[model samples]
Target: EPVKFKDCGSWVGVIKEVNVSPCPTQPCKLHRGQSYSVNVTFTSNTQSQSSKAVVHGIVMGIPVPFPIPESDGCKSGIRCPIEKDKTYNYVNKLPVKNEYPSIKVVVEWELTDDKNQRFFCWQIPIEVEA
Candidate 1:
């Protein structure tokens, strides 16, 4: 399912919307070899030098990193020299590995600004099946 969390720190932008594929409700359900995507639309409040992101699969409160390409619009994701007051849309594919453990986990998506500061952070529950 699509889950939203409170803004992390004083975000320089406002999150307009967040969309995740495959699972459309709380507790995103995934099957082995399934693919997923995440789309985020936001409006920048200030110009940024750069941006990045990371995804983690958490079980029992411990997070395991999910490998995402640096060019996936999250890590070095934004075209640098971001302009203030501009709205941007970022879409990236979430790759699910076949070796991933089958269990319920929390997926955390975090976006950072040019200063490597948190711009947005969201956490959602997810379930993976074999």
Candidate 2:
């Protein structure tokens, strides 16, 4: 039941692979107070001068910010001047806080260029069980 990351906002890049640890299957069942990891392999369709990532949790279709470390590729530490046709791998972690609401959280991963335009987007649904 693994879910493959898909293009969003008319993005044409290739998402080679997406792996969410602990919940290898789609609709990942996540236990509260635990941590999870996300790994992605991707190829860019155009040159990316600067890039950033953001993660959000959706409950009942409402988006809420999910804080991630600044060192994460999506947050920071992105190697600049990302060239097209080159494959890149990224790994980041999400710590499921105990205070999080127990609901089905659609974890949205979005990558944007320096202009704040989305180039890649994906989501993994997860059930946070207490």
Candidate 3:
């Protein structure tokens, strides 16, 4: 229903994991130039159905790296670039019939960490079904 964005490296499915949260159940702490936010869940299991969507990012700096692909790159590894507005929504009409109604949500972030305090979170859990 009017929420689309896909840059899953050309779109398909199968991301598996990337979760770095506030540590200690939703507790957050991030500081740098003063701008932080993290919550990126994108799990996808294809073959029949599987889905999930949660997107939000803003941590700025402090080594604060974000390039995952140590494994499960669909088959092998090495394919993490996705930098096209950050991909979102991605409405593919789902299972059809009344368009499946679509209204899934799970994107969390709001950070500000650096200066040694530590707590620049990052999370990535993916999978989507309709």
Candidate 4:
């Protein structure tokens, strides 16, 4: 089975599916200084002018920012001017920093629009390894 994820807070109508690349096993083993592809397909239940990608790594009970190269969701996949009832595929990269300590983290990812309305929020478990 693919990795399981929980919806933290989603306003994007319906999330069709989610996928992570190079994940042959559950609790995806993310090697230090590596990058992984994250794909999320969903139908817009709301409208938006622009979308932004935000991510974090939650270890224990604290959350740390996890920055990606492309912070613009539209440029990553979905076409700008997000419209309701439209199907969109959100694709982005997850980079594991080399300096990060080996640990298990719950990856928290979110997508928001120009109005700061978060439409897609999720948490998935992953293991950072050497």
Candidate lDDT scores, in order, read 0.71, 0.71, 0.24, 0.84
The C-alpha local distance difference test score for the whole of candidate 2 amounts to: 0.71
- Among all windows of ten consecutive residues in candidate 3, which has the lowest summed lDDT? 91-100
Off by over 4 Å in 1: 1-10, 71-79
Residue pairs with backbone atoms closer than 3 Å in model 4 (clashes): none
| Candidate 4 lDDT, 1-130, residue by residue in tens | 2457898888765777778877877788779888989998878878888999899999886899999989998898999889999989999889888755688888898898777877788888888898
| Tens-place lDDT digits, model 1, residues 47-77 | 7777777888887888899877554343433
Give stretches of model 4 more than 4 Å off: none
For residues 19-76, what per-residue lDDT tens digits would candidate 2 score against the true structure? 7888756677778777787776777777777777788888789998887665335344
Any residue pairs clashing in model 1, and if so which? 1-25, 1-26, 1-28, 53-74
Q: What is the C-alpha RMSD of each candidate to the true structure, in Å?
A: 2.6, 2.6, 18.0, 1.4
Q: Candidate 2: which stretches are off by over 4 Å?
A: 10-12, 71-78
Cα lDDT, model 1, residue 50: 74
Ranking by lDDT: 4, 1, 2, 3
Ordered list by TM-score, greatest first: 4, 2, 1, 3
